Ligand binder design. Sequence first.
Ligand SMILES: Nc1ncnc2c1ncn2[C@@H]1O[C@H](COP(=O)(O)CP(=O)(O)OP(=O)(O)O)[C@@H](O)[C@H]1O
Ligand SMILES: Nc1ncnc2c1ncn2[C@@H]1O[C@H](COP(=O)(O)CP(=O)(O)OP(=O)(O)O)[C@@H](O)[C@H]1O
Ligand SMILES: Nc1ncnc2c1ncn2[C@@H]1O[C@H](COP(=O)(O)CP(=O)(O)OP(=O)(O)O)[C@@H](O)[C@H]1O
Ligand SMILES: [Ca+2]
Ligand SMILES: [Ca+2]
Ligand SMILES: [Ca+2]
Ligand SMILES: [Cl-]
Ligand SMILES: [Cl-]
Ligand SMILES: [Cl-]
Ligand SMILES: [Cl-]
Ligand SMILES: [Cl-]
Ligand SMILES: [Cl-]
Lengths: 464, 464, 464
Amino acid sequence: MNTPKEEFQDWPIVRIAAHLPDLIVYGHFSPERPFMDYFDGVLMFVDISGFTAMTEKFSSAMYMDRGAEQLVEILNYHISAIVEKVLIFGGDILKFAGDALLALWRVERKQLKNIITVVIKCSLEIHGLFETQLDIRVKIGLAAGHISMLVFGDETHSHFLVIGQAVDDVRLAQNMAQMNDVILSPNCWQLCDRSMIEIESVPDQRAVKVNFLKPPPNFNFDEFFTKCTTFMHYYPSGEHKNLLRLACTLKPDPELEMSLQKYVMESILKQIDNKQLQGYLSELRPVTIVFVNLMFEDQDKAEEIGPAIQDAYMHITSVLKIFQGQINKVFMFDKGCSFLCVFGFPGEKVPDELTHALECAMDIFDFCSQVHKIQTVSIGVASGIVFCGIVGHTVRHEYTVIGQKVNLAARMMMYYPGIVTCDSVTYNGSNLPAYFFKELPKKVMKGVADSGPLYQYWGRTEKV
Amino acid sequence: MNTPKEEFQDWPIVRIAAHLPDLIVYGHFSPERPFMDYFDGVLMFVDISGFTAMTEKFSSAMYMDRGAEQLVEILNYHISAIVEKVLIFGGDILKFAGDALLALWRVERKQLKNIITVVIKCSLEIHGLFETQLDIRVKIGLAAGHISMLVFGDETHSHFLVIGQAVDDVRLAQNMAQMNDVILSPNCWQLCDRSMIEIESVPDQRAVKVNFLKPPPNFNFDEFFTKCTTFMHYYPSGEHKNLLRLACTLKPDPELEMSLQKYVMESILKQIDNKQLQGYLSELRPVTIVFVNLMFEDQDKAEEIGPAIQDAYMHITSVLKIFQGQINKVFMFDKGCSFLCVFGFPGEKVPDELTHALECAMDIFDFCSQVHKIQTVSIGVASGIVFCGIVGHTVRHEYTVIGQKVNLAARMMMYYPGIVTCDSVTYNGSNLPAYFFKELPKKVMKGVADSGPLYQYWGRTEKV
Amino acid sequence: MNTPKEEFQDWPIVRIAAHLPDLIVYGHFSPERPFMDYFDGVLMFVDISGFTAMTEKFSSAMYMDRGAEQLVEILNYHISAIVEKVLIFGGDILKFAGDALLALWRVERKQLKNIITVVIKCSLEIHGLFETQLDIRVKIGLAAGHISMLVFGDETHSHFLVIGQAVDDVRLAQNMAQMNDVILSPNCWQLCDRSMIEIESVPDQRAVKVNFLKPPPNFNFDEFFTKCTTFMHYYPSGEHKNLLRLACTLKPDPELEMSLQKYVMESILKQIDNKQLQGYLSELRPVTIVFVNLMFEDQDKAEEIGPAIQDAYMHITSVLKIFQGQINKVFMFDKGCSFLCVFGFPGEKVPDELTHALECAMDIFDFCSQVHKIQTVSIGVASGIVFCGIVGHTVRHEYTVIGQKVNLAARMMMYYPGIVTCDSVTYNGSNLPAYFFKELPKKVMKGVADSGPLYQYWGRTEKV
Ligand SMILES: Nc1ncnc2c1ncn2[C@@H]1O[C@H](COP(=O)(O)CP(=O)(O)OP(=O)(O)O)[C@@H](O)[C@H]1O
Ligand SMILES: Nc1ncnc2c1ncn2[C@@H]1O[C@H](COP(=O)(O)CP(=O)(O)OP(=O)(O)O)[C@@H](O)[C@H]1O
Ligand SMILES: Nc1ncnc2c1ncn2[C@@H]1O[C@H](COP(=O)(O)CP(=O)(O)OP(=O)(O)O)[C@@H](O)[C@H]1O
Ligand SMILES: [Ca+2]
Ligand SMILES: [Ca+2]
Ligand SMILES: [Ca+2]
Ligand SMILES: [Cl-]
Ligand SMILES: [Cl-]
Ligand SMILES: [Cl-]
Ligand SMILES: [Cl-]
Ligand SMILES: [Cl-]
Ligand SMILES: [Cl-]
């Protein structure tokens, strides 16, 4: 009898699981919302510099209207390589955010110290890719300690995010990095194996910069790594050691698929289901970004903030429905929970996009300001040409947005807290009377090329 | 000089041949119609229970409008595995019929006894897949003996089917099976190697149930199987022993392709030809099933019935053209030749589908009742949401329909012989006056969940 | 740590490079236009006979409207095999022209003699494929010596072509070939290793026919070939010896991709970019062919003719824009530079195609007749059903046109020099008054089945 080769079957459930971390794929938690889980781990936050400027340049005539295609190609060529190293080193990519990503090594507390060495070795290999071969740099922040996960949503949509000091720290660490630095959180530094890791300290900072690894005499990284894999639940092994992810072996299971699909946008499921040409989700399109930020008294306290995020989510999704927008991503962004919402994504191109974005934003502002435990709401609104597309590796990728206007909306919400703000394109393009707005003082902002005048959306009735 | 790897070329002719058995692919018979051929073989009829109920459940809201996609995925995951075992054990899948399939081992008469052992071993391995790991069972019927093939059609369309006592028997055998039984026809039992095959007998039945194989002391199944492959014309071997089918090696040949394509529906050829997205042939769509049954004096006598089927076919295809329907499948269904016809398939969505289905059915009834050697015509008409899609394995698959309404239309034609019947959806939804119909006595029917009231389509003029 | 398999990544840049020779892919020359480069090499011009007759036959009813699909399948099955042998023997396919192709072995002058032996061995292996197994023959012409390349175009489009005596010779040689001959140019014969190559001479010709290779006693072709690969810049080797082309390894590089894409038509880039179903570029469509020929005093003198071709190109592309046509291919066609232009390609289906083709042709005629160094302009216009599609191998293929009308337009331009001519379909179908034309004397033409009456497009005003 023959034993013929079994071709890989790229079932729908496998295509879905490319868009999710192992944390969700193999999580099996309750469908109650909010749901909270607690664990320890090491986080790596990898941030590429230079793609929003490249994004702007790929709209230029030299690209002959293949800018989106060229952009995604050159982005994924680079990001794929970084995704592979994370996976090969045993990490779980949690989420892509534009030209950045967040990765997790979830381990028992006794194993943190050793796992930190693994993650540093990985981060230095990723740093390496950028010291070779046009205009892009990488900042890496590392953190370790207690992590909480929140799952929130409704009967058709699910979102997760991670919370706690390690989460805050990893972003803090990454923000300090000079171009091409690997920075460890103070807690990471405290738990790491200091006899191996040569650091230099950082100005007015307890966080530290990694110079190099200095293995002891008998040290063998492959044997060490192998010991560490004992603690790695899903590391591909044995018959599957040739795969980047165990998720590549998932088999059809309608219950699991129903649960996983709730995390993925409808337009992406259409493509997975071969109901739309692939070409069409990579685009440079004019959209409006609505970047919502919710601040709490204590943003590390999941059982306090979880209900409030769920509450906020329920209202947000309902008004976005009305005003025709979508939630692209939710994540903790030092100080708060941020929702990155988009008007004008595939299918939801309306006229009066701008007006709607503003009225939606005001509605969210009003409602969220009264949700218990939400200290402060801030919302930034910006409009322009943004890259929208699937970023990552074939085995692990997500739909995301990259552009100067995304950055602008995020920086507005931080530099102008407690109000709804908008850019000049949104202001000028809105249907709305000029006295619905206030012209704002100009602020020098980080990592935003130029704002042009900014405004507060004061809203329809007077407040003085 | 290099000897570079030769990538598999999935030519159109290879994609076409996935939809056909070796019986047709390598058959090369006359293009005259009808054409009849005679041989011996073993038949296996594998019938999955539980997918029409799953079909009904996958229309529910929990599936979030990805019911068709989820259904086909979970169906093919299972059916693919069964198709592989048949192929690996040397069989030819002849035809898929919903959630069932029919397979053939064509051999010289002296080899039947040994081949029956092979097919039993296969059937017990398939039975096995169902004793592991939600709500599906498998009934397997086996038959052996003389088989005739009929090829019928016109200058652009071809159909085949198998005929004779073994064909009748394999369906009889399968219908007796308690859930998960393997049943042998009486003739199969008579020809098999009884010293190996432990059976228990069956109530008021000469057919028998297989308990297990009980190989003699020296018996080695792999050596036995290898001996049997001497008699297997197309068993992949040598350089091609890593392939499931020799048909995977077919090379472009416009004459052969012209001949093979006549068996495949136009919408499928469009997809093969990359002129339509794959996603679109898997659907849960509202259709009307017209299940036509033709009974003859002797349904095992190919040279008698062949002309009549050809005649019936010519008229059927012509009125289906007019009323916008299609022949999905033709097969012998104890007592007669059945045509499973569909109104509302991809492209042929009209309004007045229902009326048309009824007028078409009456026309076919009238014409076929006068074709010489057609003893009785019965036609069942039912309307509802049915799964329409490609079922099977990548190397061997066919477009088919699965649903409670398909079953209903088949059961109507059998329980209400000699008339055209319809369900309540068809009745209520038709354009037609109430006195064109007669309300029928309710019959308890097998493997149909509930009919609702049924009617006879009496037709336009009175008969009393 | 795992070392998982790296799946082949079919990046856009790799898909683009399938449409271009190594000459361009790895060329990196100036973006100035015209650009001229000079080298030596051996040329092989492989011409299949019988596909324009097959093209005509595949429009017939027997093909059941899958003629385009069947045609391209059977063409590529054959042409792929020829492309593979060229690549494996170290050649660079420069260009496809319908059912023919031109291949180049670019080498230092001292290596011509040995390389000629390699190319003959290849040509005899290709001749071989046609002596096996319906109605197609192959004529092969070989030439060797000095070659110039011209790159011409504008800021969004690039074209190249090869020029010089070897180029003229290879087409001359191929035109003499009796069906299935391999003919060497006189210069090729003069440089080859005559102690190995047994020829018979040719009627009123210095060119020669290859009978066979007659290796000396110690000769080992594999060792010889290996020596020759020292001189082959891009021969796949080492880790990549399993690939047909080094171009299969190209990595994303936006500068390179911007440069390469300028050679490829927009409709093809759309398909590369997964913005259109593949099925749609293979078609049998009614088009109008405008075959422009420019003759110069000396057509081997690149620095003379290069400016004139660039000048002609600039005007041609501008009027084709206006009249909605496209340049399909440009090449030297003994005596001159020919532009094969098409009206009615994917997307550019207009009514008044015919009129436009004629007015465009007259405009080009008028303008090019005054470009300095253009001795004579001739333009042939023919309309009918032509095959339009991607021809070649997966790793090396191009969009091209095949049909009796393409041949007709080429033969008109040669047999009726110095005027614009058209066929009867174009004449009768044009919007234009009869006295805009002159009915021409009928000429017996080579390799054109029947012309029907031909006309000169005299144009709008009288000349007498
Ligand atoms: N798709 C996305 N998801 C979440 N946050 C985003 C985002 N795009 C931009 N941001 C936010 O925009 C802000 C500007 O970010 P920085 O990270 O300082 C830009 P950078 O990394 O140096 O170069 P870049 O603009 O080429 O990315 C950050 O607060 C970042 O979190
Ligand atoms: N696509 C299809 N082709 C041919 N016959 C079909 C069909 N779908 C249903 N039928 C017929 O419908 C009838 C009801 O069949 P059964 O085989 O008793 C149902 P079952 O196998 O127990 O479970 P199921 O309804 O989940 O399939 C049978 O006569 C069967 O042949
Ligand atoms: N796509 C294309 N590109 C360039 N030239 C073309 C062409 N199609 C046809 N021609 C030209 O048409 C003319 C007729 O060519 P021949 O090469 O004698 C036909 P053949 O090769 O014997 O058989 P065929 O018509 O089946 O191809 C030649 O001058 C050829 O260069
Ligand atoms: Ca960034
Ligand atoms: Ca069934
Ligand atoms: Ca030719
Ligand atoms: Cl997160
Ligand atoms: Cl999210
Ligand atoms: Cl059958
Ligand atoms: Cl059939
Ligand atoms: Cl050329
Ligand atoms: Cl060209």
